[PDB]
Design a protein around this motif. Structure first.
Motif, short mmCIF file in Angstrom:
data_model
loop_
_atom_site.label_atom_id
_atom_site.label_comp_id
_atom_site.label_asym_id
_atom_site.label_seq_id
_atom_site.Cartn_x
_atom_site.Cartn_y
_atom_site.Cartn_z
N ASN A 15 -8.05 7.06 9.65
CA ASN A 15 -7.19 7.15 10.85
C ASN A 15 -7.46 8.08 12.11
OD1 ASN A 15 -4.59 5.62 11.35
ND2 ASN A 15 -3.69 7.38 11.71
N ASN A 16 -7.25 7.30 13.16
CA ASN A 16 -7.51 8.11 14.42
C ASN A 16 -8.61 9.05 14.78
OD1 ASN A 16 -4.93 6.56 14.98
ND2 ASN A 16 -3.63 8.33 15.30
N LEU A 65 1.02 -1.20 -0.04
CA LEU A 65 -0.15 0.02 -0.04
C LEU A 65 1.03 1.25 0.12
CD1 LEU A 65 -2.49 -1.08 2.86
CD2 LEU A 65 -2.91 -1.09 0.50
N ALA A 66 1.40 1.42 -1.12
CA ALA A 66 2.40 2.52 -1.23
C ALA A 66 2.06 3.99 -1.16
CB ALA A 66 3.13 2.35 -2.74
N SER A 79 -9.26 10.61 -3.46
CA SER A 79 -9.25 10.01 -4.64
C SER A 79 -8.14 10.06 -5.49
CB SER A 79 -10.39 10.78 -5.66
OG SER A 79 -10.07 12.07 -6.30
N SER A 128 -9.63 3.36 14.22
CA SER A 128 -9.03 3.52 12.87
C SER A 128 -9.91 2.34 11.75
CB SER A 128 -7.74 3.14 12.72
OG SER A 128 -6.90 4.19 13.18
N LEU A 129 -10.08 2.97 10.76
CA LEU A 129 -11.04 1.98 9.75
C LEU A 129 -10.39 1.89 8.40
CD1 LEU A 129 -14.96 2.25 9.40
CD2 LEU A 129 -13.70 2.33 7.32
N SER A 130 -10.42 0.34 7.94
CA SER A 130 -9.99 0.50 6.35
C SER A 130 -11.14 -0.11 5.87
CB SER A 130 -8.92 -0.53 6.50
OG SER A 130 -9.47 -2.05 6.44
N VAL A 186 -7.64 0.60 -1.33
CA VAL A 186 -7.97 0.62 0.06
C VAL A 186 -7.93 2.18 0.64
CG1 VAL A 186 -6.87 0.15 2.32
CG2 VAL A 186 -6.80 -1.67 0.51
N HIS A 221 -1.25 0.27 12.61
CA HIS A 221 -2.49 -0.38 12.98
C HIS A 221 -2.59 -1.37 12.05
CE1 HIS A 221 -4.10 2.93 15.18
NE2 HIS A 221 -3.78 3.96 14.12
N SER A 238 -8.08 11.21 9.61
CA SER A 238 -7.21 11.74 8.60
C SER A 238 -7.61 10.52 7.51
CB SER A 238 -5.95 11.57 9.12
OG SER A 238 -5.07 12.46 9.92
N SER A 295 -0.70 14.31 4.13
CA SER A 295 -1.75 14.88 5.06
C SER A 295 -0.97 15.94 5.83
CB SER A 295 -2.81 14.00 5.86
OG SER A 295 -3.90 14.92 6.26
N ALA A 307 0.80 7.89 4.87
CA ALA A 307 0.51 6.69 5.52
C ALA A 307 1.00 5.40 4.22
CB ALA A 307 -1.11 6.60 5.30
N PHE A 343 -5.45 -3.97 11.13
CA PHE A 343 -6.76 -4.24 11.11
C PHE A 343 -7.20 -5.81 11.48
CE2 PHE A 343 -8.09 -0.12 10.31
CZ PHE A 343 -7.25 0.43 9.75
N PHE A 387 -6.82 8.50 3.93
CA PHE A 387 -5.88 8.20 2.86
C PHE A 387 -6.41 7.42 2.03
CE2 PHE A 387 -3.86 8.92 7.15
CZ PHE A 387 -2.92 9.94 6.73
N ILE A 388 -6.02 7.21 0.67
CA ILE A 388 -6.42 6.41 -0.43
C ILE A 388 -5.14 5.71 -1.04
CG2 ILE A 388 -6.49 8.00 -2.48
CD1 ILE A 388 -9.36 6.07 -3.29
N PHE A 389 -5.46 4.21 -1.16
CA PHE A 389 -4.16 3.45 -1.75
C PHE A 389 -4.85 2.72 -2.98
CE2 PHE A 389 -2.96 3.67 2.74
CZ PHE A 389 -1.90 4.23 2.64
N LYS A 445 -1.32 11.23 -2.87
CA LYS A 445 -2.68 10.69 -2.39
C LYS A 445 -2.68 10.10 -0.90
CE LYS A 445 -4.42 12.35 -6.34
NZ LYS A 445 -5.50 13.12 -6.71
N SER A 446 -1.72 9.90 -0.55
CA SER A 446 -1.54 9.03 0.80
C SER A 446 -0.65 10.00 1.90
CB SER A 446 -0.63 7.91 0.74
OG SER A 446 -0.89 6.93 -0.31
N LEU A 456 -8.33 4.56 4.08
CA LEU A 456 -7.84 4.34 5.44
C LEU A 456 -8.49 5.72 6.31
CD1 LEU A 456 -6.38 3.46 8.09
CD2 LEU A 456 -4.40 4.75 7.15
#
Lengths: 220, 212
Positions: free
Chosen positions: B137-138, A130-131, B208, B174-176, B133, A170, B114, A138, A143, A172, B116-118, A135-136, B135
């Motif tokens: 977070n917190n 999960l690179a 996105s 946290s949620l995925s 995916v 984290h 926060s 903030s 992440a 899951f 995040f998109i993967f 877009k990852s 995410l």
């Protein structure tokens, strides 16, 4: 004082499995040894108990006639022989002692061993990165992670940088996909400035299929 | 079988609050009751033995009390590390019975996730499947809404969520969310988006990417 379980794993319905509970730092001849189980997402259920010195045993009505508890006092180990396993017997199995000056409660427990009663077979996980990307990010925080997919049975363990990276991690809870295989992601938030400089590797372990994968997660 | 009726099933309280968990034994079990704390994915730990004795090493904020057939575990000052499922157990008669458990959650200030998109990895795409995916977070509260939109089309029945257990230090979740498509279906679209709705957000946040 330590209790260490082993022998858990995948077994077909109607099958048999023997769990071991190796005790150390105390003599099992001096205490009672219990088996307590917990079905996924459920509560604790006492299964069986033995007084190793004289072999007196007691069982829960849900396992009576199928499970047998025994002990090898020279090996300081207790056993849970399970015959005619059913889907409902799928659970993490813990062993415990009734010990101390006058505790008479379960003061020490083992880590647990998962027993999966299923007609499905063993599949190792497929590990993908999960690179971290634009877009990852903030505001100075990126992440990244690993997707651990299509494995059976549970469990899988994940660590980052052989255990040197723990903060912001984290992993899951696994989910069962429509295919009957589990999937999970393990993510970590790191400083954005560390992306091209720090190395990030997820260490995946799937003991049910003797698999160990170390995947390097690079930006792109 | 002597029933141990534990109540409540779930409980939510702020840091510093006094929390009380009760077990009404269906029969007299005198002081033969123990209390255990279970952290997620870990073995239960003994807190109180003989209904009211504090086990060695357990913080003084935990206390047990018997009042006939009702037993109580009290956490005088709830700490973030007290997120766990608590279980009572009688050992007066065989079988030793456990209560149904009490899930204790820690209330904290609202915290926006926060997001995040993967995109799918090239390795996974080569293998003929695509997992996207998202995410969160917190965040706090646990309630969050994640919607997938593929070229503005709201997705349904092709995604799965996973929520972590409450953090023992900051009390967040946290949620995925994983969207799964075949490589062929995936290459028929361009914008993959996840839209998140949470109490800490003024309006839904969208993360996105454009395939390629």
């Amino acid at each position: 004082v330590q209790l260490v379980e082993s022998g858990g794993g995948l077994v077909q319905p109607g099958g048999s499995l023997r769990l071991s509970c190796a005790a150390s730092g105390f003599n099992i001849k001096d205490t009672y040894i219990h088996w307590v189980r917990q079905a996924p997402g459920k509560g604790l259920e006492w299964v069986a108990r033995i007084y190793p010195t004289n072999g007196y045993t007691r069982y829960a009505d849900s396992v009576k006639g199928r499970f047998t508890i025994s002990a090898d006092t020279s090996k300081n180990t207790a056993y849970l022989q399970m015959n005619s396993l059913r889907a409902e017997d799928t659970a993490v199995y813990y062993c415990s002692r009734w010990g101390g000056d006058g505790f008479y409660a379960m003061d020490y427990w083992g880590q647990g061993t998962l027993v999966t009663v299923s007609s499905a077979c063993t599949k190792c996980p497929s590990v993908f990165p999960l690179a971290p990307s634009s877009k990852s990010t903030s505001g100075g925080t990126a992440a990244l992670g690993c997707l651990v997919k299509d494995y059976f049975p549970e469990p899988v363990t994940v660590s980052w940088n052989s255990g040197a990276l723990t903060s912001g991690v984290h992993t899951f809870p696994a989910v069962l996909q429509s295919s009957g295989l589990y999937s999970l992601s393990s993510v970590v938030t790191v400083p954005s400035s560390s992306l091209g400089t720090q190395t990030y590797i997820c260490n995946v372990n799937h003991k049910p299929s003797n698999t160990k994968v170390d995947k390097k997660v690079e930006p792109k | 079988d002597i029933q141990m009726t534990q109540s409540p099933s779930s409980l939510s309280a702020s840091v510093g609050d006094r929390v009380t968990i009760t077990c009404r034994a269906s029969q007299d079990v005198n002081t033969a009751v123990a209390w255990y704390q279970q952290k997620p994915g870990k073995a239960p730990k003994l807190l109180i033995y003989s209904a009211s004795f504090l086990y060695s090493g357990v913080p003084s904020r935990f206390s047990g009390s018997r009042s006939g057939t009702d037993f109580t575990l009290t956490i005088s000052s709830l700490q973030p590390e007290d997120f766990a499922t608590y279980y009572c157990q009688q050992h007066y008669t065989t079988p030793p019975t456990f209560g149904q458990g009490t899930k204790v959650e820690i209330k904290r200030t609202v915290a926006a996730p926060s997001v995040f998109i993967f995109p799918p990895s090239d390795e996974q795409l080569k293998s003929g499947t695509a997992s996207v995916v998202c995410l969160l977070n917190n965040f706090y509260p646990r309630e969050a809404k994640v919607q997938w939109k593929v070229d503005n089309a709201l997705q349904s029945g092709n995604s799965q969520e996973s929520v972590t257990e409450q953090d023992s230090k900051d009390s967040t979740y946290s949620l995925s969310s994983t969207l799964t498509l075949s490589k062929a279906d995936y290459e028929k679209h361009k914008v993959y988006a996840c839209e998140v709705t949470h109490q800490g957000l003024s309006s839904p946040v969208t993360k996105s990417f454009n395939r390629g």
